[PDB]
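Dataset card, provenance and construction

Sequences and ligand SMILES were collected as paired inputs. For each pair, a complete structure of the chain with the small molecule in place was predicted and serialized as structure tokens. The example below shows a pair involving manganese (II) ion. Curators did not alter the output after generation; any descriptive sentences attached to a record were derived from the structure itself.
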Amino acid sequence: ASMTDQQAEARAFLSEEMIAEFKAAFDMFDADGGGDISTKELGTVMRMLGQNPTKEELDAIIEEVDEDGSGTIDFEEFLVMMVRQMKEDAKGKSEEELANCFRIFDKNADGFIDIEELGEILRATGEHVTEEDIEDLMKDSDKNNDGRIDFDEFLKMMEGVQ
Ligand SMILES: [Mn+2]
Ligand SMILES: [Mn+2]
């Protein structure tokens, strides 16, 4: 996974209209039409496009793309950094949402989802689920056989691979 290789993969990850959209903002900081912008403006374009890198993350990227000291970042490297950030942010969002999902499922707030809680939420979806079906989910997800799903087990059940 070389730079060019990473760059190829960053473009395949986005739709072309998204890429053109990203470049239209990036171009407003170029001016010289060189295809690059100052590393001092990278945080601003990234936030303009919905990303939220921390200052340490910004520092780390700049050090990664500015080894020759030109003080600029080109568009292709920009896309790589944007896809890195997108993936990190989206994963943060999913984790957050799963913790919310669990507090809701765990009706009595004991820190566990029991079969009663599990059946109540699945039946409320409107799907025609049977008690068999609920009990099958419980057994497959209950890794330590204590009859309930803790948060770790929940994460594993939901993310599936996990
Ligand atoms: Mn509970
Ligand atoms: Mn368990």
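Derived descriptions for this record:
The longest helix spans residues 75-105.
The radius of gyration is 23 Å.
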